[PDB]
Ligand SMILES: [Zn+2]
């Protein structure tokens with residue numbers, strides 16, 4: 671295993687992967703987990719906020735400012751995607 675940076679294999683965000691604590695709520699979407707601080711677009715690094723417009727395509731984070739229009743299934747009369755909320759997912763393993 672090479673991708674394992676999550677103090678083992680409990681849970682981590684694809685942006686940084688620095689431990690998913692039970693204390694810090696994490697943003698979960700289709701089938702992936704992210705940190706509320708790591709919830710930023712990969713184009714302009716705009717933080718996605720619950721109540722603000724964001725884009726989630728192929729498991730990637732974009733924003734209203736970039737708005738990848740060349741490959742957005744549903745980008746018709748203004749896509750209305752809103753950033754999800756952070757909830758507690760899984761605790762990280764701590765090797766004592
Ligand atoms: Zn993170």
Ligand SMILES: [Zn+2]
Nearest residue numbers: 711714733736
């Ligand atoms: Zn952006």
